[PDB]
Amino acid sequence: NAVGIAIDKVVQEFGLHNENLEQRLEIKRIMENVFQHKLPDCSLRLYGSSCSRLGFKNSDVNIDIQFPAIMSQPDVLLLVQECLKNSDSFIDVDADFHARVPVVVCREKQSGLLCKVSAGNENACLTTKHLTALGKLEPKLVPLVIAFRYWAKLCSIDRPEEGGLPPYVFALMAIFFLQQRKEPLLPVYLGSWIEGFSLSKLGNFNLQDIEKDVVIWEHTRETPIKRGQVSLILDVKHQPSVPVGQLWVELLRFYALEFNLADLVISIRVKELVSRELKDWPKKRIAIEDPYSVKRNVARTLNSQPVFEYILHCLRTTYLEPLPPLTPKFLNILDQVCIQCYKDFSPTIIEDQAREHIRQNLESFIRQDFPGTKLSLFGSSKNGFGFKQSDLDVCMTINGLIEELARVLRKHSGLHLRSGLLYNTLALHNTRLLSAYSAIDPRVKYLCYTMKVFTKMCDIGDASRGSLSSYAYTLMVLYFLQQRNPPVIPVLQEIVDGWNIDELPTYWSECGKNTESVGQLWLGLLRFYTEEFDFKEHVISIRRKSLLTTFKKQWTSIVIEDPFDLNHNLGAGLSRKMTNFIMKAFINGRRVFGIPVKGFKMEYFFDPDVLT
């Protein structure tokens, strides 16, 4: 009772009392009239630590929105974002949709509390009911959670951004502790009592919802399958009224000396200990399971090791500068150098006929063993952007329709000594797209050749290195050419495999608008990609001229997109180290090409040592 009184004082100091309960309800009341004008059919379901009243007094307001099946979740939050920004009652509106749960962050003007406006998060909403139901039935639970959470805040363990445990995980720890007690105060919703139960198929069972102080679970629209119900409270009429202080102290003991937090899983659904082997999870760090969410893993939130030992430690104790202005003559020098980069590296007719001869030889040789084959070159060779000593990409195809193919090539003596250099349809299609984009204007080919030489001199463009491929840069340069304020060329898609020049001026209204020199565009590309364009909130894509944020495709982690290959991401294997090197190279290019110098071209501007 001595310690049991101490926690109650903690509850008074940092608990959420009634006056805060209604004050937060008026938050929902004011939200109601904001979303009503544009989304009359939508409704709000209050959730989080507010209804469960397990959080602190100054806890954030967690509010969820429910919409019919016709509307899509991204469409609702986009509309909700507009409804909150144009409201004078709210400030500091932010759109952090790239988190695990897309929510809209805003601060109440009167109270100053942070409101987390989630959408379509039924898992969290139903979780609050379970937490809320237990709190009322178990008056000793609320003091335990508030005191338990308060101690973590002192140690800096409750911060999600820092890597600390999210606040909702702390509620599960307190609930599970009471269940594990040999004199349980709470019942288990899942157990061996159920007919045909077994730990092997524990994942099939799921708690649908709670109604009338009774949990409902289903095993695998109403269907005729095994179903049952379990009460939320053990029906004991003469259990000792032990002080709440003992539970708080015993909680520290169980998780510090008795319960193994490194090789066991916490689950409030069953009494038997669940090991990491059953769920096939690491034993490196703590693992916790949410009742309604049977796939919830706390390892995702807690990846760092020192923090994991820190959790066990604290519990034991309680027991781009501006650049100079450009000059006309230096702009002319930039134009000259770009044109020179086009004219030196462009394959000649003898090289194209040599490629055609190579294609014919390969076609015949493969026809010897695989008659009816049809080969077609692709890549830099025929995309309208030539390049010497470049890889020759070819697409195998058989009319009328890797290990075996390789064995055949070993037979031919020449494999290419002379030159020294399956069903890839999308590659051919984007090759034609790139050729069409190149034929529109000589500046496009000039800047693309300049980009190719720039990436070749900076030791980037290699797939094995993990950096972006040359095709990605070819798309990116077109993205810059299309994104600048004066359009130079349009997106050809707006004007197969589940994926969708003379007369262009007639249809395109802004044809010929840009009159800037080629060197000016080359420097503008660097400026745009180093100072203006943000890679963390936009996606490089030439499918349409409108913006494309990363949240829609959920590519939360440079991002470039294929014109026809939407779901495929070229920067999937892009490691942050390579991104740092890429941006360093681009900054160096801006430095060299943005500082005019009088008196002295290829050997100087594109110097590998200086640029790296």
Author numbering: 293 to 512, 528 to 626, 987 to 1068, 1080 to 1093, 1111 to 1116, 1122 to 1195, 1206 to 1210, 1217 to 1273, ...
What did the study's authors say about this model?
Tumor-suppressor let-7 pre-microRNAs (miRNAs) are regulated by terminal uridylyltransferases TUT7 and TUT4 that either promote let-7 maturation by adding a single uridine nucleotide to the pre-miRNA 3′ end or mark them for degradation by the addition of multiple uridines. Oligo-uridylation is increased in cells by enhanced TUT7/4 expression and especially by the RNA-binding pluripotency factor LIN28A. TUT4 and TUT7 are multidomain enzymes whose specific targeting of RNAs makes use of three zinc fingers, combined with two copies of a nucleotidyltransferase domain (NTD), one inactive in the N-terminal half of the polypeptide (pseudo-NTD) and one active in the C-terminal half. Our structures reveal that pre-miRNAs engage the enzymes in fundamentally different ways depending on the presence of LIN28A, which clamps them onto the TUTs to enable processive 3′ oligo-uridylation.
To visualize the TUT7 apo state we initially isolated the enzyme bound with UTPαS alone but found that modification with NHS-polyethyleneglycol4 (NHS-PEG4)39 was needed to avert excessive sticking of particles to the air–water interface where they are prone to denaturation. The TUT7 structure in an apo state at 4.03 Å revealed an overall ‘C-shape’ conformation composed of two right-handed conformers distinct from the ‘L-shape’ of human Dicer, which in addition remains similar in its conformation throughout its activity cycle. This difference suits Dicer’s role as a ‘tape-measure’ protein capable of recognizing the length associated with a correctly generated pre-miRNA, hence its need for a fixed dimension, whereas the TUTs need to be able to function in two different modes (mono- and oligo-uridylation) and, further, to be able to act processively on a bound pre-miRNA substrate under the influence of LIN28A. In both the apo state and the binary TUT7 complex the two NTDs maintain the distinctive ‘C-shape’, apparently due to their direct interaction with one another. By contrast, in the apo state no obvious density was resolved for the backbone link connecting the LIM and CM, with only a small region of the linking density visible associated with the LIM. Nevertheless, for maintenance of the distinctive ‘C-shape’ structure, the two NTDs of the enzyme must still be interacting directly in the apo state, albeit relatively weakly. After binding to pre-let-7g/LIN28A, the zinc finger in the TUT7 LIM was observed with good density, whereas it was unobserved in TUT7 apo or binary states because of mobility and/or disorder.
